[PDB]
Symmetry: C4
Subunit: 336 residues, 4 copies
């Protein structure tokens, strides 16, 4: 009963537990490189990805997002004809990078072939529990058929889970069980892993093979995104921070004179229409997408200025965190 | 020796909110998992739930509904021996269903237990605030001598030593929990208690040795807290606050702010004792939930998902192989959640 | 060789308070209402119940001190009055039933004068309260008194330290008062950044006062019945309450109505108001709780239950055998009516 | 290698609210303690309080009132060079008092230092969000090269390595703080910061091997926090928020919801110039001396418990005890 013993040993860290420690710097924030590479085929100018959710990313979002340096993932709560159409639309809008989300359905192989012929750069094979034989075998089918296609599998929270996917044929791994804003996995199932600890553990596995890791969910401030990138992620993925953007799908509701967008989990009652592990909410209208990106990539250049990082690689390997108490982060006057 | 003096502050405690389950390799879907459990040779549940023997939570109706779902009801003991034997027999008249009844450590305890046996009760629940007592121990021995085949659920405890005590006194099952109840003020009035997750783990660890199942009793708010409990060594969880608002629970529904409410009170509360006192329970109100079946579906639904993340095809696999990860207070905690308007009727 | 010990040890010590721990149940076949809560501070000083009301002008005067003694406890009459009036408050208590009584004196020039008046008034114990008991002036004050009154019960405080407790014991003190900072009306921790978590302070103090068989008093920080149990179980013989007794019928001062609700004034001795008749006390208000008896009945009832879970027949077993478990903030966490 | 990779989450950090000061044996009455302090042969303060170099906190009126309480004011740089040099001289002619002036790491830096030295300023404060840069080190070396006896205060830093590097560039005094500030959002926008107590200790531990003092800057909300910061190795502390609402502070009283407030904002906020400071309001605290009285009042109290006759005893002998959140836990 070795297992009985290790039940409560492991320990986890979230974004609010740590801070990056400043180091010797001779590179200015405006001078750094926030560029990143997921593969030969996938090169990003800014390490940002919009989430494959029906309230975050359609063709307009992926186009806006591509034009910024990043990448959008067309959600799959759509007919196959429609998704390939939106993919083909983004692709021909200047030869932009687009990604698309595929379920681990029976139909998935059919959906993937439509997306490949519409010329997607990367498909996202995402499910709630990416450490399942269903997903492993599914990746190996897709990899057998398309040995050059960028595959992003998830979701995973552990290194053994990460290893299983890399060997199945995954060249990018997506991290996060529990942490998303609209996520209720932990409340309803008791399951999940602190996102910083998740990213670090998974990155430590992927680092050996040289595979990029996506941090997905739980990000609220540019700060948390700098932390995700220094914890080992190549790239972060946002839902709530883009849902209120002008280029996301769906229109602007007005309630009491204030502008709002709907943001909901893909496993909430709406996106499904087996208990729900997603919820439905509203987010404030944030206007143009460029506004949100400028702030995020600005904050990133500051953090990398503090850490002495010229590029994201220097950041991932050398950056040092410091742990604190909860008392600690109340240290981060009524405001106008 | 001061060995007791310098060990005053060594032990650490964990509760539900300190931990999360860690996803593992899984080949099993939530709909194919087995939520069956065997408390004993004679007593088997189709779902790991037991409604608590409280006068606001469980009577004959709730036991019948609980059984129908594949769980078990514990008919509370705030009533005559005659009218509790009434309720026991009624559950058995309704399709030979499994039913429990609570019996406190008293003088009339045996007179009460007897009547229950003649009504063909499946399990008797020996409940005391402090189960780690000779008084309780020698009462469990008395019942085992007179009824060798009777299921005995004896509690409550929080330590391994208490556990092995009741097992060797002839109890089939141990009910774990000092202080974690929603309506419990034992931790405030007496400064006494163990964080439930540690108490379960500690008690189960001793009880596995004897092949004895334990029950996690109290402190469960969400369904995820229940997955956490089962995964910590418990065979079955016990619920009061979540079953109180349910329509099949004892008590009139009351209207406040147009909303309907039901009364949930501790058995150690002032009102419950009246059916110079230092109470260790409080009276409150919980919202009307509706039918029992809708509440159970969400609980079991969250269990299956949780077992699916862990790769447990059965509850025994979860008990033995599941792994927790500890977080800080920050770890337990933009988008405004949209909740639909209420039903006034 | 220059030592770097002090510099490196700056952040090593760790502290616990009441909310940080819970008591673990043990085997126990003593019922709560059959436990002995009798306690012995000295042969001269025996209490039925382990309770002492604080020497504050908002908490303890004659009528209060009578009430406490009669419940089996003890009142420490406060020193914010003339010597002549303090000694007459002590007399009134002493001659109504032959009750035990305490009396507060500060380390001052006219302290010795006050003590004799109080000793002549047949006081059972005097309490030498200073904000910092580990001072040379306080230590020399205790030798000064022990020398002249070798039969007198002396309580010296406040201390937070094992050293400090050793220091006051060696000066001749029968009983030690423990507490720097944990007061409800205290702002020492905020205006000066000084203090020790009450549970650790007690534990660390009693650890030293055990070697000499000297009792300690847990001074402040108790908000709930269960926190008193935690104090006694950490090494204290007795506990001193202020806030809890301040809003009681036998308290000095009358009942004020605030938004149609009955209240009483409770203020620190270091607050501006007490000082006139930099502050490290503030003034507040506490709910009117009625007569002392019901508050004592719930605090003693709460101890009885605690000793019942722990298997403690008497306060000595609890003090020597009770084991705690540490929890976290989430472990400290329905519509109550 | 894998060394940097495994060191990522190893370090722990403490802030003011994490700890308290352990009362030791005491000979000393609060009124008899010496709160005097010496930065430099050139520079000495009767109290350990330095007024922050911000457009919301300090100008010539504030600097004068600081000096006359026993401390120091640091004239901010959001002004013309000869406007700043005129502020420095107005304080100088107001009774031969102590003044400092903030200076940025730019090309006009040396041009502005020439004017400030011309008005006989005592110390300059080279302030940057990131003092551990080659820019600041190179600037310090070239000022130390030209003005060898000018007191140079350099920062901010948060580490020993940074502290060491500035001492070897020529800084007499080292300023410590990245994140702790009340108007600071560096933690939130860049995820970067170091808990102040751990920072001052780690920076003092390196500084006292050179006889170099450190300033603890920001995060101070209580007098008890100042006692804590001095006891972890700081000679002197710098305050912004607790000085913004006083009368001698730049601007004047303004009214929100019919109460009196004074605007208080960071130098990296939108107004004072991506933002890392914010803009807000603090209550009109009244005159400077009343606030100073309560601060130094608190310090005498804390030195009393710890038994420190002077700030050196405190710095070398004070012991902390760590606690939890429930440890930092009557209608007042
Ligand atoms: C996070 N999440 N969760 C869900 C619910 C869900 O699928 N939960 C869930 C929980 C646990 C699960 O455990 C396993 C699986 C699994 C799935 C799949 C295969 C066997 C192992 C969801 C449902 C529909 C659409 C989207 C989502 C979704 O995004
Ligand atoms: C803290 N802070 N930040 C800022 C903005 C700022 O300079 N941020 C910033 C962030 C990150 C930074 O990282 C580096 C540097 C740097 C600067 C400079 C040296 C190289 C490394 C500020 C701007 C104007 C006036 C005052 C301030 C200021 O006080
Ligand atoms: C927690 N609690 N407490 C009480 C009051 C109570 O009995 N408290 C209590 C406290 C502490 C106790 O300690 C012991 C015992 C005991 C009992 C009995 C056996 C010896 C040791 C209660 C009363 C009736 C019904 C239920 C309860 C109850 O659930
Ligand atoms: C907590 N407290 N503090 C105070 C203020 C106070 O005395 N503070 C204080 C602080 C620090 C102190 O340090 C010492 C002493 C001392 C005193 C006494 C002499 C030895 C060294 C107080 C004053 C008058 C009456 C009551 C009180 C009081 O109860
Ligand atoms: O239905 C849901 N339940 C739980 N997680 C979800 C659901 N829908 C999306 N997610 C995850 O949550 C992330 C968005 O979280 P956010 O970035 O914090 O808003 C997505 O990238 C998904 O990985
Ligand atoms: O008055 C009481 N005081 C303390 N615990 C109680 C009292 N009444 C019931 N309990 C326990 O609390 C459990 C219910 O806790 P809950 O599921 O969190 O609401 C019951 O099954 C009992 O074991
Ligand atoms: O003004 C003061 N400042 C700090 N502590 C005080 C002051 N006055 C009384 N005390 C202490 O506070 C205790 C009361 O604590 P309470 O029971 O939590 O309110 C008394 O026992 C005194 O020792
Ligand atoms: O704009 C800003 N962003 C971040 N920190 C600042 C800014 N302006 C001033 N500071 C720092 O914050 C200190 C004052 O912090 P306070 O005493 O908590 O208000 C100053 O002395 C500076 O070191």
């Amino acid at each position: 009963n070795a297992m009985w013993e290790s039940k409560f040993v492991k320990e986890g860290l979230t974004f609010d537990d740590v801070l990056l420690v400043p180091a010797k710097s001779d590179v200015l924030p405006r001078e750094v490189s926030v560029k990143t590479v997921l593969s030969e085929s996938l090169q990003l100018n800014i390490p940002l990805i919009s989430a494959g959710m029906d309230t975050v990313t359609e063709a307009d979002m992926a186009i806006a997002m591509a034009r910024q340096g990043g990448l959008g993932i067309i959600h799959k709560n759509m007919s196959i004809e429609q998704q390939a159409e939106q993919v083909d639309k983004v692709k021909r809008s200047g030869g932009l990078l687009v990604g698309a989300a595929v379920g681990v359905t029976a139909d998935a192989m059919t959906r993937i072939d439509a997306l490949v012929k519409a010329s997607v750069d990367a498909i996202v094979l995402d499910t709630a529990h990416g450490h399942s034989q269903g997903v492993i075998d599914k990746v190996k089918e897709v990899r057998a058929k398309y040995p050059s296609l960028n595959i992003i599998a998830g979701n995973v929270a552990t290194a053994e889970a990460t290893k299983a996917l890399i060997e199945a044929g995954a060249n990018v791994v997506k991290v996060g069980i529990g942490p998303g804003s609209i996520c209720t996995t932990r409340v309803v199932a008791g399951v999940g892993v602190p996102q910083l600890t998740a990213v670090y553990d998974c990155a430590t596995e992927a680092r050996k093979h040289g595979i990029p890791v996506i941090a997905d969910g739980g990000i609220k401030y540019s700060g948390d995104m700098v932390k995700a990138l220094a914890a080992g992620a190549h790239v972060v993925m946002l839902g709530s921070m883009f849902a209120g953007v002008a280029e996301s799908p769906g229109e602007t509701e007005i309630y009491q004179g204030r502008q709002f967008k709907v943001y909901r989990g893909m496993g909430s009652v709406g996106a499904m229409e087996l208990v729900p592990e997603g919820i439905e909410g509203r987010v404030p209208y944030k206007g143009p997408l460029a506004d949100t990106v400028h702030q995020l990539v600005g904050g990133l250049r500051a953090g990398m200025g503090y850490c002495g990082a010229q590029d994201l690689e220097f950041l991932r390997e050398n950056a040092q965190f410091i742990r604190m108490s909860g008392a600690g982060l109340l240290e981060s006057v009524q405001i106008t």
